[PDB]
Design a protein around this ligand. Structure first.
Ligand SMILES: *[C@@H]1O[C@H](CO)[C@@H](O[C@@H]2O[C@H](CO)[C@@H](O[C@@H]3O[C@H](CO)[C@@H](O)[C@H](O)[C@@H]3O)[C@H](O)[C@H]2NC(C)=O)[C@H](O)[C@H]1NC(C)=O
Ligand SMILES: *[C@@H]1O[C@H](CO)[C@@H](O)[C@H](O)[C@H]1NC(C)=O
Ligand SMILES: *[C@@H]1O[C@H](CO)[C@@H](O)[C@H](O)[C@H]1NC(C)=O
Ligand SMILES: *[C@@H]1O[C@H](CO)[C@@H](O)[C@H](O)[C@H]1NC(C)=O
Ligand SMILES: *[C@@H]1O[C@H](CO)[C@@H](O)[C@H](O)[C@H]1NC(C)=O
Lengths: 566, 167, 65
């Protein structure tokens, strides 16, 4: 007894009669449908305004999916007879308005969706007789002002979404009687100037989003009663100044975000009573200098990221109360004349970026109290010299990085303490010759990299106390001869130098012929499938120049008989 | 309260053009598992099965061993039989899947959830969704989520993030 | 005791089990009576932090037409 137009399903584990009238070109509803249905799908069709008497004789329901389509009118008495309905969906129709009474026939509702419709001017008392609703979605509409007591009668509500709308004002009586709300969302609206008595009787809130609005003031006293709360968000706004009594009592808080604002200075004793934070973010603001004891009380932080302010000087004793801090970004602000002994106390760090700053030099007491580090970055400052006793304190260290500076030579007692290095990167400098013995202490090293310098010779006694290499690069360096000292290599790049193809250059030929996967010819660049069409190739060609009888030719293929007086 | 639905992309002559198509001679030519359109020959009854091998013959099922105490790993490594207090990672997963809930339909190559253990810390190594007998790119990271240098020797989309070796 | 699976292996396993039908992140609300009342968090949290197996995976496939 199915209308022979829809896929009729049957009992699976109960008496469900799921009727599938979804993807089909339909005009107004079919008839002769089953009476004992338990779920009905109707999305995708081209219906219009429903008749008042449409859904009677279906005293068992609980699913009325109606997304898509071209619906715009709900004539009165439309939902008459549905006493056991439990879900409803009207997502992407083009509705325009709802009169009073349309929800008087359907108590025991448990979710509602009116998301991408087109409607404004809610009435005063629609959602009444709905003391069991749990969800409510109203985002992406044209709402601009709400009367008082619009949410009247919604006792047991737990979620609420107002996003993409155009609200501009919040009177102090909107959220009244919502004693079990749990998540609020007010993003992407046009609010300004949070007042001081709105959020006072929501004693169970847990999330709060105020992401992208135009906010320029926050009265002192707001956020007063919110005992339980764990996620604030005020990222993209225009907050111009924090007072001392702006966060007075939010004990349980755990995540603040204040990026991309326009804060211009900090005060003596902000940020107190926040014994339980674990992440701060003060990103692209305009903070100018740090006074003594500005961060105080945040004795349990983990991440700071002051990464693009115009910070020009830091006094000794700024980072004071930060005990358990592990990561600090700091990279991008022109810290030219930093003092010394400024990082004392922080003996629990693990990673410190310092790139992008305009440092200049390194003095004997720059990094002193950091006997816990594991990763330094120092990429693009512009150093012209590092002193001899600068790194005698960092016992644990696994990666240096000095990529694009302008050093010209290294002191011969520099790596005395670093007995645990594993990555050494010294590209793109102006070095002229590497020291004679200053590579002894490195015993756990692999992955050396000295490309793009202007070296001129490598003696054999230089790479002997390194029995762990697996990677080596020498591109574009102006060398003439080389013999592979580490036998268990797995990579070699050698393109760009003026090699001399004579007798002493033969072990390289043998090693390249017997180990063709360690010294390849070319490897195919990365590709992701859509851009795999072009086969980008990185090259590795060895040329002969100093002898004119083998000039131009490659080494792997020259004659097989030139090495006969050799 | 319903969210989007994920479903594989309908392939066309483009796929068969990119996918080398030389089906060797055999009986009961079938399609390869997952959702990928490159025809191959089926397996017999009693040969190893898996997630990245071919699919069993007609009227057959690929079930793990009747013990092993670890089904999903045993099926990932190809050992089946054809038989008839936040952390650094939870804070990222949260606002990752808090964004995939306001959209309509999407494809299984647009999901980008990280891979981290049961204490909120990144695990060792990260990967990307596959497409049936063709895995995705992978790389190595550290505890807080910073990448490390590394190379490959077998080929692209392949790495062994050992204790510290990235061979 | 219980095993756990999280990352892209989860997506591959879900592709393998369901097939050409699809899947959701929450339950497909089959005869919703207490599906919303009793809150099932989702497949990601349950299989990344508590326990995971094949029956729970099968429970989330889209229904065939
Ligand atoms: C510490 O702070 C620095 C601040 O610069 C962070 O570096 C920045 O990381 C972002 C990641 O989103 C980079 O943005 C990217 O830019 C490229 C274009 O250049 C764009 O194609 C990408 O879509 C993305 O927007 C940003 O450029 C980069 N800044 C630098 C140095 O270039 C760094 O990640 C932070 N590290 C942490 C938090 O540990
Ligand atoms: C619906 O109509 C379109 C054209 O109007 C047609 O292409 C399509 O096949 C129809 N749907 C079905 C299920 O036949
Ligand atoms: C329900 O039953 C009434 C009375 O028997 C019948 O006339 C009608 O067609 C049925 N359905 C509707 C549209 O209410
Ligand atoms: C080789 O090194 C020199 C020295 O800095 C540099 O100017 C040149 O650009 C490098 N070659 C290439 C191809 O970049
Ligand atoms: C490098 O050698 C390959 C052959 O292996 C050749 O096709 C390519 O043009 C050469 N490139 C250079 C830098 O001459």
């Amino acid at each position: 007894a199915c209308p022979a137009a829809c896929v009729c399903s049957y009992d699976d584990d109960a008496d469900e009669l799921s009727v599938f009238c979804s993807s089909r070109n339909l005009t107004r509803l079919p008839d002769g449908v089953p009476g004992g249905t338990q779920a009905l799908w109707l999305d995708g069709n081209n219906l219009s305004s429903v008749p008042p008497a449409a859904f009677q004789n279906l005293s068992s329901l609980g699913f009325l999916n109606l997304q898509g389509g071209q619906l715009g009118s709900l004539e009165p008495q439309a939902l008459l007879g549905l006493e056991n309905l439990c879900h409803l969906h009207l997502e992407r129709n083009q509705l325009r308005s709802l009169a009073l009474g349309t929800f008087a026939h359907t108590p025991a509702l448990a979710s509602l969706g009116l998301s991408n419709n087109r409607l404004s001017r809610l009435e005063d008392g629609l959602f009444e007789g709905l003391g069991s609703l749990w969800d409510l979605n109203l985002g992406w509409n044209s709402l601009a002002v709400l009367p008082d007591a619009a949410f009247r009668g919604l006792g047991s509500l737990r979620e609420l979404v107002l996003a993409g709308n155009r609200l501009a004002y919040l009177q102090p009586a909107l959220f009244s009687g919502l004693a079990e709300l749990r998540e609020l969302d007010l993003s992407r609206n046009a609010l300004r100037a949070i007042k001081a008595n709105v959020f006072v009787q929501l004693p169970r809130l847990q999330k709060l989003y105020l992401d992208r609005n135009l906010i320029a003031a926050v009265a002192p006293g707001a956020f007063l009663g919110l005992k339980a709360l764990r996620w604030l968000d005020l990222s993209h706004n225009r907050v111009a100044g924090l007072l001392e009594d702006t966060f007075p009592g939010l004990l349980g808080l755990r995540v603040l975000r204040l990026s991309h604002n326009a804060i211009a200075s900090l005060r003596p004793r902000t940020f107190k009573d926040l014994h339980f934070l674990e992440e701060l973010q003060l990103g692209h603001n305009r903070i100018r200098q740090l006074a003594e004891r500005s961060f105080e009380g945040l004795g349990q932080l983990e991440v700071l990221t002051l990464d693009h302010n115009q910070l020009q000087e830091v006094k000794a004793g700024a980072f004071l109360g930060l005990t358990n801090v592990a990561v600090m970004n700091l990279s991008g602000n022109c810290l030219r004349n930093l003092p010394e002994q400024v990082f004392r106390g922080l003996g629990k760090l693990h990673s410190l970026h310092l790139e992008g700053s305009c440092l200049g030099r390194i003095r004997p007491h720059t990094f002193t109290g950091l006997s816990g580090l594991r990763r330094l970055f120092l990429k693009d400052n512009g150093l012209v010299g590092i002193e001899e006793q600068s790194l005698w304190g960092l016992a644990e260290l696994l990666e240096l990085d000095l990529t694009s500076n302008q050093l010209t030579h290294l002191p011969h007692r520099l790596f005395q303490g670093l007995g645990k290095l594993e990555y050494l990167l010294l590209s793109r400098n102006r070095l002229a010759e590497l020291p004679a013995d200053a590579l002894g202490p490195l015993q756990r090293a692999f992955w050396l990299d000295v490309s793009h310098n202007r070296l001129e010779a490598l003696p054999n006694s230089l790479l002997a106390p390194l029995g762990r290499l697996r990677y080596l690069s020498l591109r574009n360096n102006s060398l003439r001869t080389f013999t592979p000292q580490p036998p268990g290599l797995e990579r070699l790049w050698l393109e760009g130098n003026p090699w001399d193809c004579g007798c002493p250059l033969k072990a390289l030929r043998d090693f390249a012929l017997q180990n063709p996967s360690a010294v390849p010819r070319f490897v195919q660049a990365i590709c992701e499938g859509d851009d795999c069409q072009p086969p980008a190739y990185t090259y590795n060609n060895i040329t002969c120049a100093s002898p004119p009888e083998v000039v131009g030719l490659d080494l792997r293929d020259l004659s097989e008989a030139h090495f006969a007086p050799c | 309260g319903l969210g989007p639905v994920v479903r594989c992309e309908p392939c066309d002559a483009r796929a068969l053009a990119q996918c080398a198509p030389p089906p060797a001679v055999c009986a009961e030519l079938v399609r390869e598992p997952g959702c990928g359109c490159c025809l191959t020959c089926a397996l017999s009854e009693g040969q190893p099965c898996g997630i990245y091998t071919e699919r069993c013959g007609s009227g057959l099922r690929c079930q793990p061993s009747p013990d092993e105490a670890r089904p999903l790993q045993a099926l990932l490594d190809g050992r089946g039989l054809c038989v008839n207090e936040y952390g650094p990672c939870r804070r990222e997963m949260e606002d990752t899947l808090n964004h995939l809930k306001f959209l309509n339909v999407l494809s299984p190559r647009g999901v980008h959830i990280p891979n981290c253990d049961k204490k909120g810390f990144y695990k060792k190594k990260q990967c990307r969704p596959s497409k049936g007998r063709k895995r995705g790119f992978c790389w190595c990271v550290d505890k807080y989520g910073q990448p490390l240098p590394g190379y490959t020797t077998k080929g692209k989309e392949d790495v062994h993030c050992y204790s510290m070796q990235s061979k | 005791g219980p095993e756990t699976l999280c990352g892209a292996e989860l997506v591959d396993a879900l592709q393998f089990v369901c097939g050409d039908r699809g899947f959701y992140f929450n339950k497909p609300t089959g005869y919703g009576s207490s599906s919303r009342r009793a809150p099932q968090t989702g497949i990601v949290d349950e299989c990344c932090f508590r326990s995971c197996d094949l029956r729970r995976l099968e429970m989330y496939c889209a229904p065939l037409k």
